[PDB]
Write a protein that binds this ligand. Sequence first.
Ligand SMILES: Nc1ncnc2c1ncn2[C@@H]1O[C@H](COP(=O)(O)OP(=O)(O)O)[C@@H](O)[C@H]1O
Ligand SMILES: Nc1ncnc2c1ncn2[C@@H]1O[C@H](COP(=O)(O)OP(=O)(O)O)[C@@H](O)[C@H]1O
Ligand SMILES: Cc1cn([C@H]2C[C@H](O)[C@@H](COP(=O)(O)O)O2)c(=O)[nH]c1=O
Ligand SMILES: Cc1cn([C@H]2C[C@H](O)[C@@H](COP(=O)(O)O)O2)c(=O)[nH]c1=O
Ligand SMILES: [Mg+2]
Ligand SMILES: [Mg+2]
Ligand SMILES: [Mg+2]
Ligand SMILES: [Mg+2]
Ligand SMILES: [Mg+2]
Lengths: 209, 209
Amino acid sequence: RRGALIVLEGVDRAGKSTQSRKLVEALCAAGHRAELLRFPERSTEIGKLLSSYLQKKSDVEDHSVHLLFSANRWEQVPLIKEKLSQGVTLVVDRYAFSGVAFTGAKENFSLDWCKQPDVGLPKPDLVLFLQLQLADAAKRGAFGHERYENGAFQERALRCFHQLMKDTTLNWKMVDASKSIEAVHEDIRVLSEDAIATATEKPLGELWK
Amino acid sequence: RRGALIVLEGVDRAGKSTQSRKLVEALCAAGHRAELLRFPERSTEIGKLLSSYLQKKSDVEDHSVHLLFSANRWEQVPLIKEKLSQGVTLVVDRYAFSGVAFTGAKENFSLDWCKQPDVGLPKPDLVLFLQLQLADAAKRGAFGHERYENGAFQERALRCFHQLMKDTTLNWKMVDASKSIEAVHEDIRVLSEDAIATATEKPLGELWK
Ligand SMILES: Nc1ncnc2c1ncn2[C@@H]1O[C@H](COP(=O)(O)OP(=O)(O)O)[C@@H](O)[C@H]1O
Ligand SMILES: Nc1ncnc2c1ncn2[C@@H]1O[C@H](COP(=O)(O)OP(=O)(O)O)[C@@H](O)[C@H]1O
Ligand SMILES: Cc1cn([C@H]2C[C@H](O)[C@@H](COP(=O)(O)O)O2)c(=O)[nH]c1=O
Ligand SMILES: Cc1cn([C@H]2C[C@H](O)[C@@H](COP(=O)(O)O)O2)c(=O)[nH]c1=O
Ligand SMILES: [Mg+2]
Ligand SMILES: [Mg+2]
Ligand SMILES: [Mg+2]
Ligand SMILES: [Mg+2]
Ligand SMILES: [Mg+2]
């Protein structure tokens, strides 16, 4: 009985990391075997290059950094398929959708070109998109020193996320991330319990193919 | 008057490196501004990962290593376009075609998926493919300790190279690399002088788009 692959995507400060942590804690307390993953995975050789880039400690050519983000997913694919086949549900904080949206927000990058490197990745059984109005995101923090920490760029990435959501091949669910941390958690956890039960019924899919 | 982008591809031991070196030497002695490039470019952070992989000092997941090879090309794109626009002809020892053929030779990799990451790269004005029968390649050396150093795998990559050569968008020229080093050089140098003259007439193209 395979585990489900559940991805959290969403606007800045909507709570992807907070909710992915709480979801894994809650699923394990309810008897599930569940583990947390995130992308970028900064612990690998490629992950260190990406971390330096995002921190602005280094500059990387836009196409090159897009492919490194994708490669950083591919290198975890053997582990992801092993865990899922062992019945472990994986809760992932960002995935290929962030990959496509963030490069897709840059000038002269088509969504098609941006998608290709990730075609074939393990297909999420559930993609949660945490929505939050900017007035509410503004009370949760201030723009940082990191790469992409600006409103004009996050808006362009948001348009790309909406283009991706038109893809009916994927089990997208919108989450109203403006509620309390607990209320949002409950919405996500109930959606996750449903997906976990149905994932044991269909083989793990392939993304965008 | 832009420089030309000339790529050398070919079967193992056909003489890509020998001929790319001699071509750059000959073009500069004939008054051209010409420089040598090669892929993988092992000097960068990504290039070091690729070098370790090819030397079998490390293992890399097949998709991940394919994207790193492509990224290693992208990171040199700003330099390539700068040199070409300055009138410098660039002679390159392997390019995206090797990228697609070598991953394409592995099981479960379509030529389509393999091509995507390199779509958009600076398009070669001339792609030379050095052909050599295996009996003749056999007298030029013995299989090494490196990755891909085996006949069954080189044969699969060779089929992929022939699929790529069906692409009429590209100025492919076959070279009979079985002749002497000097005779092959002369064949390549005359083809290169012709391409250099015509490249000053059309803008640098984009590969596979
Ligand atoms: N529903 C929520 N209500 C109020 N604050 C929240 C909520 N979700 C997250 N936060 C706070 O907002 C900040 C951003 O949360 P985080 O999970 O790191 O977001 P993301 O990973 O989407 O950037 C954190 O300080 C977190 O405590
Ligand atoms: N035309 C040729 N005739 C005879 N030996 C050659 C010829 N071209 C290359 N060689 C030798 O064969 C070997 C492989 O050449 P090299 O240029 O390194 O090939 P490649 O880069 O295609 O693997 C080298 O020792 C080189 O000196
Ligand atoms: C996974 C992923 C993240 N990103 C970005 C989004 C964030 O700006 C950044 C750090 O992620 P975080 O907000 O999850 O800490 O990485 C990409 O640009 N491409 C990718 O493939
Ligand atoms: C450029 C390139 C080379 N290769 C391989 C072909 C050779 O086996 C190897 C070393 O190159 P070399 O024979 O030019 O020294 O790298 C790939 O697998 N992918 C690539 O994108
Ligand atoms: Mg986060
Ligand atoms: Mg396509
Ligand atoms: Mg951040
Ligand atoms: Mg060589
Ligand atoms: Mg070698």
